[PDB]
Design a protein around this motif. Sequence first.
Motif, mmCIF file in Angstrom:
data_model
loop_
_atom_site.group_PDB
_atom_site.id
_atom_site.type_symbol
_atom_site.label_atom_id
_atom_site.label_comp_id
_atom_site.label_asym_id
_atom_site.label_seq_id
_atom_site.Cartn_x
_atom_site.Cartn_y
_atom_site.Cartn_z
ATOM 1 N N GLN A 1 0.810 -1.212 0.000
ATOM 2 C CA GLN A 1 0.000 0.000 0.000
ATOM 3 C C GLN A 1 0.846 1.267 0.000
ATOM 4 O OE1 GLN A 1 -2.852 -1.931 -0.816
ATOM 5 N NE2 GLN A 1 -3.864 -0.174 0.148
ATOM 6 N N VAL B 1 2.365 4.614 -1.049
ATOM 7 C CA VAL B 1 1.980 5.707 -1.939
ATOM 8 C C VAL B 1 2.919 6.895 -1.746
ATOM 9 C CG1 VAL B 1 -0.382 4.931 -2.159
ATOM 10 C CG2 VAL B 1 0.207 6.364 -0.262
ATOM 11 N N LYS C 1 -3.900 -3.709 -8.641
ATOM 12 C CA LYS C 1 -4.600 -2.523 -8.177
ATOM 13 C C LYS C 1 -5.545 -1.954 -9.224
ATOM 14 C CE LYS C 1 -1.351 -1.266 -4.599
ATOM 15 N NZ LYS C 1 -2.424 -1.241 -3.569
ATOM 16 N N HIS D 1 -10.025 -1.664 -7.864
ATOM 17 C CA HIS D 1 -11.003 -0.589 -7.995
ATOM 18 C C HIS D 1 -12.252 -1.035 -8.746
ATOM 19 C CE1 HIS D 1 -7.004 1.502 -7.586
ATOM 20 N NE2 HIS D 1 -7.679 1.967 -6.552
ATOM 21 N N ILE E 1 -6.722 9.091 -5.714
ATOM 22 C CA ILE E 1 -5.608 8.195 -5.430
ATOM 23 C C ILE E 1 -4.437 8.539 -6.341
ATOM 24 C CG2 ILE E 1 -7.342 6.472 -4.854
ATOM 25 C CD1 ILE E 1 -6.161 4.847 -7.274
#
Lengths: 125, 25, 129, 81, 206, 96, 87, 217, 97
Positions: free
Chosen positions: A82, A84, E87, E91, E196
């Motif tokens: 995760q 970022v 990923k 979504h 994001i």
Amino acid sequence: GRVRTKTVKRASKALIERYYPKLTLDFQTNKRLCDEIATIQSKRLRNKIAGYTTHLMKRIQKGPVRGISFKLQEEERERKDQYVPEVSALDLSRSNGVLNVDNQTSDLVKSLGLKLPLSVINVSA
Amino acid sequence: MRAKWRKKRTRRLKRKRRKVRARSK
Amino acid sequence: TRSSVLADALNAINNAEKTGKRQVLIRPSSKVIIKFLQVMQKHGYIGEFEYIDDHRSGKIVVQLNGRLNKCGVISPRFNVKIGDIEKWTANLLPARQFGYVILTTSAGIMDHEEARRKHVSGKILGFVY
Amino acid sequence: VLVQDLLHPTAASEARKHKLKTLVQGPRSYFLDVKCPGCLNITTVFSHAQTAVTCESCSTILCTPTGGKAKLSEGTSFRRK
Amino acid sequence: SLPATFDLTPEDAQLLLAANTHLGARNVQVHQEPYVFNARPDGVHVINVGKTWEKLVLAARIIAAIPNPEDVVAISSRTFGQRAVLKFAAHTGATPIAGRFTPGSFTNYITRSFKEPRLVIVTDPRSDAQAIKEASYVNIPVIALTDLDSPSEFVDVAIPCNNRGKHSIGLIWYLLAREVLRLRGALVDRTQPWSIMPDLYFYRDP
Amino acid sequence: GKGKPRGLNSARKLRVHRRNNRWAENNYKKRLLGTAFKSSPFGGSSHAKGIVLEKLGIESKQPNSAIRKCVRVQLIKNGKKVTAFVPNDGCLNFVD
Amino acid sequence: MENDKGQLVELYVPRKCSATNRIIKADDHASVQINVAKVDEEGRAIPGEYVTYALSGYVRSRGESDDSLNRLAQNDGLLKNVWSYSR
Amino acid sequence: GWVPVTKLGRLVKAGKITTIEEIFLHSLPVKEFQIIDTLLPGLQDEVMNIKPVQKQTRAGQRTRFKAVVVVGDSNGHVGLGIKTAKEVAGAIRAGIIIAKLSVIPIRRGYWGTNLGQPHSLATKTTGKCGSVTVRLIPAPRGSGIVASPAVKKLLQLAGVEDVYTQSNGKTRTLENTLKAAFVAIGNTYGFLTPNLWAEQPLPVSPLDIYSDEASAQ
Amino acid sequence: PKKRASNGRNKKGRGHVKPVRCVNCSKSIPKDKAIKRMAIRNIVEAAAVRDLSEASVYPEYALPKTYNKLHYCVSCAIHARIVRVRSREDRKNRAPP
RNA sequence: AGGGGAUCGAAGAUGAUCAGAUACCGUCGUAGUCUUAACCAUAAACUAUGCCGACUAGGGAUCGGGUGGUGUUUUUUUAAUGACCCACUCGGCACCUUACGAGAAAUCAAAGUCUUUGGGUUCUGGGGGGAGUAUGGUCGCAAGGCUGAAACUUAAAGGAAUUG
Ligand SMILES: [Mg+2]
Ligand SMILES: [Mg+2]
Ligand SMILES: [Mg+2]
Ligand SMILES: [Mg+2]
Ligand SMILES: [Mg+2]
Ligand SMILES: [Mg+2]
């Protein structure tokens, strides 16, 4: 010539991924653990699987082992997954808002006419 | 037996015969 | 060397259609070729073809609609009697209800269907279906 | 590409092709209005000359034949056509 | 046709050029010539990102047309496309295949990984050639993230991008995920960018 | 062009070529050369009488290991000596 | 195809390729049919109505489907300035 | 009974697809033979040949039996299947299943005028397998099936009643002759004819519309 | 059947090249067909090199080297294990290692 | 038929091996191998693939010619040219991937554009042997070449690939 049969290996591959947090790196504890958690048929096979399972603990201890993924390994990977980066993610700020390109990309921007900061560097050859 | 040894054998045979036919010609 | 420009024009179209091309270029595009294209276009097997005027022999770019199966020439141009048309049509065409045998007759290039109702016969040029 | 306008090729595509293989074949050669270094007389010299063309005043050399285009004698001004 | 908002916004082209997606390959095949804007000295070709964006928008409309999001398979085999696909799959429904494809996942209706998608998306036609060939037996469309040197066989839709850059591959997947969410009641706020960060589609080490 | 000529005026080349290659047919060659009428036991006839000259028991070809019990016959029309089978269980006694 | 009193007598009418007018037969398992979502204002997929293209397996195998979709989408306005007729 | 593992099977079992021609129209690949039985119930079956295929091993010659089976009623549907099993009976069972998977539709046209129902082929076609080439010519009404007894029966399980035939190569090879004819009859929808020149709105696929009921949870 | 596209040699455009003599059996083989290895070996050794360096005058002496091109017929190359017959699809591999 | 004849070397000699070895192996060695003036006209003379023409798919390399870069390179601190690089194109030797397509397959960018069979043309084949034999002709100094059967015999011979 002590190569272990896949029935022994796949039995460990059916044990660690579901009970890693409560296992131990000690074989003596493991075979006592193998008594009730695992419903095996023979004592010789009981000790063989406990030995390979204990060996897998050492292999797991020094980095992840391919092909076997215990539950707590899943969350360990996902937290790392995760990520970022809060900056440098092609959000300009390379030259503080003036991206760099070659002559052709520059004219490309003009083929589309979009308003974008820009630059141009010489090439050769 | 190659056909070339057939060829070479037949050539000799074909040429001992034009010598024996010559004694009558 | 070339001997039948119509054969080369028909073959060029045929190779193009099997490759899915919607057009083809033809050289040198004589006026028998143009007449042969006109009968095929009259029956809908091709689209619009345009003649490029170079000062030597001509060029043609034929637009193909994908409805063409096999455009071919019959060489030599056998002298076909009016009663011998049926034999050629049976041998050359897939069915009696469609396809055409293009005949060069004294009344001009025409398909076997029209040449039957004008009651003329000549030499066989080619087929189309 | 399986679909293209063979009747209107792009000018860059035709300049790439061999002269006999364009949509309508034509020459890439041209004529030069060469000027003698001394005199003002104008001589019409083919680009792919292949003969040692000679002016009046410069009656030594005006161009030099080669395998393709003729080589001007390094002292001569010229304009196309 | 297509409304004026769907045009190449400058903000989207801000980073689309930043990830060097315009950097094409030295070798270009006759089926990728239209996307070749020009050839740079040193031989690197440049892609028209207007072609990349417009083809990407077309694929999203193709993607956001299957009634179910769970049968739009996103394929990757290269290590750079692994995180981009997964990923992408988070979504939307978009069942992913990251790593090995297990030949016979579209035929062989008895296996565990047997699937029947209405659309397959491959990160690289060269590396995912097994997935593409497997998809050509079962009448499934293919959307490829092709480069200037990549094969075009059984590739219905091709988005020209830089297959040799992890930044480009992650960005293309990110943009594709954003447009398909925009083409549904999921990111109805069209004007502002996606919340994001696109970086989370990029490659991860170690 | 796939070998043969096609032109409308080539019928001579087509016919002469066909007549030349027709000789490769063993059945057409024999009729045109007339070998049966010239060189054969029967002068191109389905049947022929003859005179029985001797009785033969011939050993059948391998693998059968049998005896065929034929007869050597002198033909009446041309005098050629042939050997002929006697097909039945026995019937060699009949021939004499 | 019909008969004497009309009344079409044909199992089915096969779909033709959108790029070559080729019949897509029953055992053409490489032939795809792409559906592109209709889009109203503010970009809603409005599921149910689509713009549909049929690509024969021949075009896909030969590798010209990607350009064929470009040309057909350019024709119907799905794409704006990607495909150029003259090349 | 039968549990559908494929989207096509789930639609067919539920009844969303009530005719096989919807499968043929969209070229949907059939993988469960239950789909063919559900949409083509009266599908009579025959076997053309049973032959042994042998493989040499260290000890003796291993023998297996290869069965060719023809499915298809007399109404424009045909299948063909080649299966080799250890026993003849098993080769027939799997031979029937394979032939039902390979069911294809054929085209029936008129040799002459469009009078009555179609009786012959719509166009002369040809199929090749191995060296065997089989050519089918439309025939006048009442001509029967002018074909070898094997290909003749394959045409009887097709609904054709008038067709001519020509052949090439080692026609004594039955599998290649059957495959060549089977290829030939299937090409009858391959051929393009003027009546099919008219454009169509290209209808949506059943796997698209009924994609809710199909592929359950 | 044709085992190789280049039949057994490298000749497309000649009709005749020349013969050369095998170094092991003196067979005459065409120069294109002959298996060729280049032998690039030090003048002395990799073992005796130390000994000759200690005993050499001129404390720094560049060690010379021997060169000779070797041509083998097909038989001698196989027998000496230069070529090592390969599979049907591996024989298409023309890489040196 | 002259010349020349170092080397290698049908024949021959001889030494081993082998049961035998008038073979392989070793040492000699005539003709030949070279040349000039004339013969012969055959080779797995092969890409076992006639010649001319058109079209059909992607690439890179290379040989020769040409065209263009405000390209690199030199002795006069650059010029022209040469050499090199890049982009084209014409012609050639080929190669690589693929199967449109072909084929029995091996494989083939032609061995593709063939039962949807016709661009032009020359030659050759008709199951395996007998047999490229007999005879006749013709050419050749000769060797032998070209042309070339029949009687008779035969259920196969053969091509490609699969398992062992
Ligand atoms: Mg061999
Ligand atoms: Mg030679
Ligand atoms: Mg030859
Ligand atoms: Mg060359
Ligand atoms: Mg015969
Ligand atoms: Mg014979």
